[PDB]
Amino acid sequence: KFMEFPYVSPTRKQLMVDLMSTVENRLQSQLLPCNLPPDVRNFNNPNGSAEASLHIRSGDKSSPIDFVIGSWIHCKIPTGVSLNITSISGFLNSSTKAPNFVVELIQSSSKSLVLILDLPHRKDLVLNPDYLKEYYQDTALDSHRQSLLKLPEVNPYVSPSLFVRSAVSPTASMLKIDAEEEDKLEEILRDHVSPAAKEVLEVWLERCVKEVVGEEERMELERRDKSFRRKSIEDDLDLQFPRMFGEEVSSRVVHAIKEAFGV
Amino acid sequence: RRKFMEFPYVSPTRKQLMVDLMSTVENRLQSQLLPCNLPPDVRNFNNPNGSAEASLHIRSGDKSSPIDFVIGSWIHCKIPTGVSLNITSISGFLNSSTKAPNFVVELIQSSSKSLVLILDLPHRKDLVLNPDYLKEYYQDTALDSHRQSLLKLPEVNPYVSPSLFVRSAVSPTASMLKIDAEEEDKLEEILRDHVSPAAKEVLEVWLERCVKEEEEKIVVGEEERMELERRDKSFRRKSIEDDLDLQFPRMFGEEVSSRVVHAIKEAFGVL
Ligand code: NA
Numbered sequence: 001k002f003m004e005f006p007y008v009s010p011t012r013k014q015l016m017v018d019l020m021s022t023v024e025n026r027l028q029s030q031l032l033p034c035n036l037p038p039d040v041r042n043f044n045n046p047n048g049s050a051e052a053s054l055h056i057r058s059g060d061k062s063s064p065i066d067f068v069i070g071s072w073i074h075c076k077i078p079t080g081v082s083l084n085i086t087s088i089s090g091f092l093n094s095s096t097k098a099p100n101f102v103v104e105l106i107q108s109s110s111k112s113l114v115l116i117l118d119l120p121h122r123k124d125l126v127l128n129p130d131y132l133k134e135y136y137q138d139t140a141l142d143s144h145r146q147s148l149l150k151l152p153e154v155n156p157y158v159s160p161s162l163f164v165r166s167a168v169s170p171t172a173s174m175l176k177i178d179a180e181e182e183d184k185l186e187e188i189l190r191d192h193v194s195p196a197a198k199e200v201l202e203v204w205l206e207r208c209v210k211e212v213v214g215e216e217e218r219m220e221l222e223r224r225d226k227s228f229r230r231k232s233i234e235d236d237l238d239l240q241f242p243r244m245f246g247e248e249v250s251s252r253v254v255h256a257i258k259e260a261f262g263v
Numbered sequence: 264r265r266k267f268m269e270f271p272y273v274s275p276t277r278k279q280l281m282v283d284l285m286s287t288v289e290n291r292l293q294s295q296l297l298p299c300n301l302p303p304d305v306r307n308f309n310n311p312n313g314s315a316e317a318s319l320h321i322r323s324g325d326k327s328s329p330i331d332f333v334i335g336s337w338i339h340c341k342i343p344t345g346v347s348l349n350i351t352s353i354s355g356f357l358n359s360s361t362k363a364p365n366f367v368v369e370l371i372q373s374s375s376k377s378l379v380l381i382l383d384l385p386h387r388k389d390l391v392l393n394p395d396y397l398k399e400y401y402q403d404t405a406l407d408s409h410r411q412s413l414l415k416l417p418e419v420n421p422y423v424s425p426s427l428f429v430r431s432a433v434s435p436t437a438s439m440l441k442i443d444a445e446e447e448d449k450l451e452e453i454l455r456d457h458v459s460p461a462a463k464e465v466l467e468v469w470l471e472r473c474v475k476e477e478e479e480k481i482v483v484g485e486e487e488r489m490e491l492e493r494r495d496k497s498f499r500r501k502s503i504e505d506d507l508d509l510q511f512p513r514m515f516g517e518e519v520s521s522r523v524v525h526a527i528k529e530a531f532g533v534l
C-alpha cells in the first residue's frame with residue numbers, strides 16, 4: 001500500500017514498482033513488516049494541496065540493513081504545476097561499513113526531470129582509498145553516470161545544497177534530463193534510466209548488503225550515519241513538509257521519520 | 264636549463280597567471296615561509312634523453328606557522344605521439360595546527376584541443392560528519408560563484424577527472440573545468456579576464472580565511488589533530504603513488520625520478 005504511484009506516468013510508475021519489488025523480495029528474510037501508523041503511511045494537507053505516501057521496512061538486528069524507505073510525494077503548487085517526487089533509499093547499520101543506496105526522481109514538467117541515483121559512501125573516501133577501490137572502482141558504477149551523459153537531453157545536475165553534493169559518492173548520477181517532448185523523456189526513462197537504476201540496485205544487494213567492524217570504526221559509522229540523517233531531515237523536511245502538508249500532518253510524520261531514522 | 268618562474272613552453276597569459284599567483288603566495292606569506300632549500304638537482308631537472316623537463320619550488324612553513332609547505336611546479340613532456348604535455352600548478356598545504364582547507368590551482372594541457380583547470384580549497388575534514396566545517400569554509404564564502412561564473416562561458420565545460428580519488432579530495436565548490444583551446448586568442452582572453460581573476464579571488468579566501476593570523480592560538484584538540492594528521496597522510500601518500508610513482512620514472516627516467524620523488528616525499532612527510 002504505496003505501490004499505486006497514482007500521480008506519475010506509467011513508465012516511471014513501473015520503474016518504482018520494479019525497484020521496490022526487487023528490494024522487498026531479495027531482503028524479505030531480513031526485513032520486518034512496516035510498522036508505521038496508517039496516518040503516516042498515507043497522508044495529505046487538509047486543504048488538498050499535497051498528497052504523499054510512505055513505506056518503511058526496518059531491518060532485523062543480526063542483519064546488515066538499518067531500514068529501507070520508499071516514498072512518493074505529489075504537490076500541486078498554487079500555480080497549477082504539480083511537483084512529483086518518487087524515491088527509494090536503503091540504509092545499512094553500523095554492523096557493516098558498506099554503502100547506502102538511493103534513487104530519486106524529481107519532476108515538475110512533462111519534459112524535465114532530475115535524477116539522483118547513487119550508492120552513498122559511509123566512510124571518508126580520502127582517509128580510506130581502499131573503500132573507494134572496493135565499492136566504486138572495482139564495480140562498474142561510474143559507467144551509468146557516463147552512459148546517461150552521452151544523451152543530448154541529459155546534463156549534469158548540480159545541487160544548490162553543498163551538503164547533498166558532498167554526501168553522494170564520486171560515481172553518483174546527478175542528472176537533469178531536458179527532453180523537450182514528453183515522448184522522448186519517457187523513452188529516456190525505460191531505455192536508459194531504468195536499466196541504470198536496476199543495475200545500480202543489483203550491486204548494492206550483492207556487493208554492499210550480502211556477505212568484523214572494530215569498536216571505534218562502528219562508533220565512527222554511527223556518528224557519520226546520524227550526522228547525515230539529522231542534517232538532511234533539517235534541510236529537506238523541517239521547512240518543506242510544514243509548507244506542503246500543514247503543521248499538524250508534518251509534526252506527526254516528521255516524528256515518525258525521525259524515530260525511524262534514529263534521530 | 265629553465266628555472267621555475269620562467270615557466271617555459273606555455274602561452275604568455277598562462278605564464279603571467281602562474282607568476283602572479285606564486286608572487287602573491289610568497290609576498291603575502293612573508294612571515295610564514297622558510298626559503299627554498301631544494302638542491303639544484305631537484306629545483307630543475309630533465310630526462311637525459313631530452314623528452315621531459317621540469318622545475319620544482321618548495322617553501323616549508325616555519326615552526327609555529329599554520330603552513331606545512333607551499334609547492335610550485337611546471338612540467339613539460341614530449342609524448343611519443345608528437346604532442347606535448349604542459350602542467351603548471353601551485354598548492355598550499357596546511358599542517359595539523361589548523362583544521363582549515365588547503366589550496367590548489369593546476370592548469371593541464373595534454374593536447375592541442377583543451378586546457379583543464381583545477382581550482383579549489385580542498386577540505387581537510389569529512390564534510391558529512393562535520394556539517395559545520397562545510398558551512399564555515401564553503402557555504403559562508405563565495406567559493407561556488409567562481410565555478411558557476413566560469414561555467415557560464417561557452418568555451419568552458421565541466422571536467423570530470425578519471426580518478427575517483429581526485430573527485431573525492433576536491434571540495435564541493437571546486438572549479439573543475441575544461442576550456443576549449445583551439446581558438447588561441449579566445450583561450451588567452453578566458454585566462455586573462457576570467458580564470459586569472461577567479462584564481463586570485465580563491466587565493467584571497469585561502470590567504471584571509473584559511474591561513475588567517477587573527478588569533479593563531481586556536482589550538483586544535485587532541486582527537487581533531489589526530490584525525491587531520493591521519494587524513495592528510497592518506498591523501499598525500501595516495502596522491503604521490505597516483506601522480507608521481509606511476510608517472511615520473513617514465514617521464515624522467517628512474518635515476519632523476521628517484522632523486523625528485525624522494526625530495527617530494529620528504530616535503531610531504533610521507534611514510
Ligand atoms: Na549530454
Ligand code: NA
Pocket residue numbers: 413414415416417418419420
Ligand atoms: Na559553459
